[PDB]
């Protein structure tokens, strides 16, 4: 009876929408926690007197400890300050030392921090030295208008993937390239799975707009929404409305 099917459809829409929100929140809160951390670090570095910031030895001795304590406080992989001479002061998981081999002026985290007055957030990428996938938060630090260097903080992208996977619902994230990035059902991360149906249904319907689509000639229901450069989706079987 249409009345019954409408009731089930309105219920499941609300539910699935709510769960999609949870996944959206997860991504937002991950980012903002890392941003706040980075901002606080910026502030403590810029607070130092110039004298502590204007020689490399002073950077080592005065900024290094700050990098280290901050790194430990959140269990970041790397926390670092890149200088215009190409050297980096690096605090890494497993005192901080100056490194001259990290080709920083070719790195987006460095370049892009100098082109915005905000924190820059990279797509996930393979960390040069630790060979883990990371998301980097970078920020050009200025003390009274004078550039000191570019701060970077590397957080394992697995941390976000794990958070998303724990969420209720069959929710998942695509990265900026529409490749699968995280999922509650680990099987979805098969790079051979085609997601065209879901992605085409999202493109037709827009953010947070519930839709029908087919899998193996069965009916499924879902929704997606943009969250920063990610696309977050939920889908379920339409058996809840049909049977
Ligand atoms: C070993 C620190 C690497 C940092 C500077 C950064 N993750 C990069 O790959 O450029
Ligand atoms: Cl993020
Ligand atoms: Cl952002
Ligand atoms: Na958080
Ligand atoms: Na991305």
Author numbering: 39 to 132, 137 to 285
Per the authors:
Small molecules in the environment can be sensed as attractants or repellents by a repertoire of chemoreceptors termed methyl-accepting chemotaxis proteins (MCPs) or transducer-like proteins (Tlps). Analysis of the crystal structure of the LBDs of C. jejuni Tlp1 and Tlp3 revealed that they have a double Cache (dCache; calcium channels and chemotaxis receptors) fold. dCache domains consist of two tandem subdomains (termed membrane-distal and membrane-proximal) that likely emerged through tandem segmental DNA duplication. We also discovered eight new small-molecule ligands that, in addition to isoleucine, signal through Tlp3 as attractants by binding directly to its LBD, and determined the crystal structures of the respective complexes. The hydrophobic side-chain binding pocket and the conserved protein residues that interact with the ammonium and carboxylate groups of the ligands determine the specificity of this chemoreceptor, which appears to have evolved as a receptor for natural non-polar amino acids.
